[PDB]
């Protein structure tokens, strides 16, 4: 059972926080009394978000502008964010490289860039954040999509990158469990969200109900606060019925009896 | 005689029952073919009377496989050596291979970058290399192969793992790359469907296989029955040959029982009515 008080005084990083869901998450955390450090490329927009967050009641609020294409930036941002706040309780990984619906033909640069930004940078951020999260017994929140669980035409690269996050973060979650790293990892599986970016990209191609981003932002925060492994958020009740893979959980359990990890 | 001959192997039941004759005279590329499963696939294809071009970094090992493929009965057999780390080499290799055989019927993506079982700490270099070699290079090879595959209504065969379907500790980077393959290739399969690109895509989800490389990496860590590489290699060929979307191959019957995800297929089918692609 979530209570907003759970975020009060928590030190939180939100990436891709200048717009959409990331910005909504910043605002919610602001209202909850959390310390926040938001990031994205747009310094000016970040400034506005930061100002509004202080308005909303954030215990403290800062932004650091940069591109997540740059792994050195990602790494230094975490350290700098942690220094401003005196630690870190939750790492919210939410940015993605800009993407539109298109048939895949030969754009290898977009497939590479998508892997770099949507996947690689999440890993670099995690490595950089880990000692602080370990010290706080904090949380990693990874923003994924229904397209990171099942296949859709027109987003091959993006979907590849969301699939990767599941495979990467679900692996380390089992490693953490065994090495006693008390850091939660919540994978967020979102359907269509009414963000300006998504609504434009799907215009005339996709005819489905877009869920509200303010609510989506909250359900993400909630999942992290409760240390849930996965969060499922979609308009359709049929998604919520079919989305889970209980067989996958069973299989992982059955295989767990066939390997020995005492040796690190 | 070949000029006065014609017809088709793929008649009634061919989508269900494999026959070695289905690869006879087919033009096939196998990557990661100097050892393990890839080498075993090369051999099976040889026996079936296929034309084959194999690749891997090791020229001397490739040479040996080629010699043994011709012995075995392959229509023709060649090798081109190089690293799949180099996207230029992956791209030219497809063209070179296609030219040696005068076309392409089946693309078998099987290589990976060397990997061992280790906890993930901070090796970002291995995570990147894993994505480049195990995933990115598959895409570049697919891009290069497509024109020839479209002309022959051929096949793409993607070798994956159980770790490309469910999570395992100690192979975070590797598993990320295998999961990436399913997301990418499953997406283009729906794309080919609607754009009438008659090129099949077979994703192979393999359990532990008794290759030298795997048996070494799991030693003292993993205690499971390993399945034979000869038969694993054949089930891969079969899958591609029959144009099946997914091949599942593992020692446990419990894997075969639980591994499929019918709910994913139902969802994908429900979501298909919510989007218009004509354009
Ligand atoms: N919207 C949907 O329907 C939907 C559905 C499923 C999942 N999701 C997930 O929701 C998360 C947020 O989506 P959204 O729709 O809210 O996104 P959005 O409104 O398009 O905003 C994306 C954010 O990422 C930032 N960004 C873009 N390129 C960047 C780069 N190279 N380096 C650093 N930051 C960069 C953007 O700001 P700057 O341009 O200022 O850098 C912006 O703050 C994503 O991970 C996405 O996969 C969304
Ligand atoms: N073995 C298992 O238990 C198991 C389980 C599930 C899935 N699989 C999958 O089966 C496939 C083959 O596995 P395996 O166990 O048979 O592997 P393996 O015996 O180690 O063979 C790997 C092959 O890839 C080549 N290779 C390595 N690095 C390369 C590079 N940078 N560029 C090009 N070629 C390179 C190797 O030749 P060179 O070193 O000479 O380049 C070799 O021919 C992989 O996709 C693997 O993930 C295996
Ligand atoms: C053909 C089609 C139909 C539906 C979806 C779908 C469903 C749920 C979530 C998402 C998703 O992750 N989005 C929304 C679109 C913009 C993105 C891709 C940057 C983020 N996309 C995708 C499709 F490609
Ligand atoms: C703890 C653990 C980790 C991995 C597995 C497992 C199961 C099925 C297939 C595979 C697989 O893809 N392999 C085998 C290992 C060498 C690789 C990783 C290059 C290829 N791996 C099982 C485990 F118990």
**CA proximity to B141, closest of B241, B31, B63:** B31
- What are the CA-CA distances from residue B52 to residues A119, B25, B70, B191, B239 (Å)? 36, 9, 10, 28, 18
C-alpha B179/C-alpha A95 separation (Å) is: 20
Pick the CATH number of B19-279 from 3.40.50.720, 3.40.50.11890, 3.40.50.300, 3.90.950.10: 3.40.50.720
Within 8 A by CB and 6+ apart from A70, the residues are: none
Helix, strand, coil shares of chain B as percentages rounded to 5? Answer: 50, 15, 35
Helix (H) or strand (E) holding A189: strand A184-190
The residues that bridge with A14 in the sheet, in sequence order, are A38, A92
Buried-state track A123-158, b at ≥16 Cβ within 10 A, e below 16: bbbbbbbbebbeebebbbbbbbbbbbbbbbbbbbbb
Q: Which two tokens stand for residue A145?
A: 């999509």
**CA proximity to B159, closest of B174, B143, B144, B147:** B174
CA A18 to chain centre: 14
- What are the CA-CA distances from residue A135 to residues A88, A181, B27, B126, B132 (Å)? 9, 10, 57, 26, 33
**CA proximity to B85, closest of B45, B122, B157, B140:** B140
Q: For residue A39, which phi and psi values (nearest 5 degrees)?
A: -140, 160
Within 8 A by CB and 6+ apart from B29, the residues are: B52, B53, B54, B55, B94, B97, B104, B106, B107, B108, B145
Q: What's the Rg (C-alpha) of chain A?
A: 18
The residues that bridge with A233 in the sheet, in sequence order, are A190
- Sorted by where each begins, the domain ranges of chain A are 1-264
**What residues of B are in contact with residue A145 (Cβ under 8 Å)?**
none
* Stated length of chain B: 279
DSSP 8-class letter at B107: E
DSSP H helices, chain A, are 20-31, 43-56, 71-85, 108-115, 121-136, 156-179, 196-202, 213-225, 237-242, 246-256
Q: In terms of CATH architecture, what is A1-264? A: 3-Layer(aba) Sandwich (3.40)
SS3 state of residue B125: helix
Please report which ligand is nearest the Cα atom of B274: 3
Please report which ligand is nearest the Cα atom of A203: 3
Residue A142 near residue A187 (C-beta atoms within 8 A): yes
C-alpha B231/C-alpha B43 separation (Å) is: 12
Within 8 A by CB and 6+ apart from A240, the residues are: A232, A234
**What residues of A are in contact with residue B188 (Cβ under 8 Å)?**
104, 153, 156
* Stated length of chain A: 264
Q: Which two tokens stand for residue A116?
A: 């770099």
Nearest-atom index, ligand 2, CA of B40: 16
C-alpha B222/C-alpha B220 separation (Å) is: 6
C-alpha A215/C-alpha A243 separation (Å) is: 19
CA atoms within 13 A on the CB side of A111: 28
Helix (H) or strand (E) holding B101: helix B87-101
Distance from the A21 Cα atom to the nearest Cα atom in chain B, whole angstroms: 23
Helix (H) or strand (E) holding B143: helix B137-152
CB atoms within 10 A of CB B222: 18
Q: Do B223 and A152 touch (CB under 8 A)?
A: no
Q: For residue B260, which phi and psi values (nearest 5 degrees)?
A: -70, 150
Sign of CA dihedral B35, B38, B43, B44: positive
Q: Are strands A90-93 and A139-145 parallel, antiparallel or unpaired?
A: parallel
What is the resolution of the experimental data for this entry, in Å? 2.3
DSSP 8-class letter at A210: P
Angle between helices B36-47 and B59-72 (to 10 degrees): 30
Helix (H) or strand (E) holding B268: helix B262-271
Experimental technique behind these coordinates = X-ray
C-alpha A253/C-alpha B172 separation (Å) is: 17
Q: Probe ligand 3: pick from A95, A144, A149, A192, max atoms within 8 Å of CB? A: A192
SS3 state of residue B205: strand
């Amino acid at each position: 059972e979530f209570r907003p008080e759970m975020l009060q005084g928590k030190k939180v990083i939100v990436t891709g926080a200048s717009k959409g869901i990331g910005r909504e998450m910043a605002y919610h955390l602001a209202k909850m009394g959390a310390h926040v450090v938001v990031t994205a490329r747009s310094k000016e927009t970040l400034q506005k978000v930061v100002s509004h967050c202080l308005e909303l009641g954030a215990a403290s609020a800062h932004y650091i502008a940069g591109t997540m294409e740059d792994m050195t930036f990602a790494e230094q941002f975490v350290a700098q964010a942690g220094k401003l706040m005196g630690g870190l309780d939750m790492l919210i990984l939410n940015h993605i490289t800009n993407t539109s619906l298109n048939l895949f033909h030969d754009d290898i640069h977009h497939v590479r860039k998508s892997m770099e930004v949507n996947f690689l940078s999440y890993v670099v951020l995690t490595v950089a954040a880990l000692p602080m999260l370990k010290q706080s017994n904090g949380s990693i929140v990874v923003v994924s999509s229904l397209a990171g669980k099942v296949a859709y035409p027109m987003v091959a690269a993006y979907s590849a990158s969301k699939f990767a996050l599941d495979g990467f973060f679900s692996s380390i979650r089992k490693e953490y469990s065994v090495s006693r790293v008390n850091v939660s990892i919540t994978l967020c599986v979102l359907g269509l969200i009414d963000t300006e970016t998504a609504m434009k990209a799907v215009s005339g191609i996709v005819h489905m109900q877009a869920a509200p981003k303010e609510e989506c932002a909250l359900e993400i925060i909630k999942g992290g606060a409760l240390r849930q492994e996965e969060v499922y958020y979609d308009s359709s009740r049929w998604t919520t019925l079919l989305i889970r893979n209980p067989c996958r959980k069973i299989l992982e359990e059955l295989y767990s009896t066939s390997y020995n990890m005492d040796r690190f």
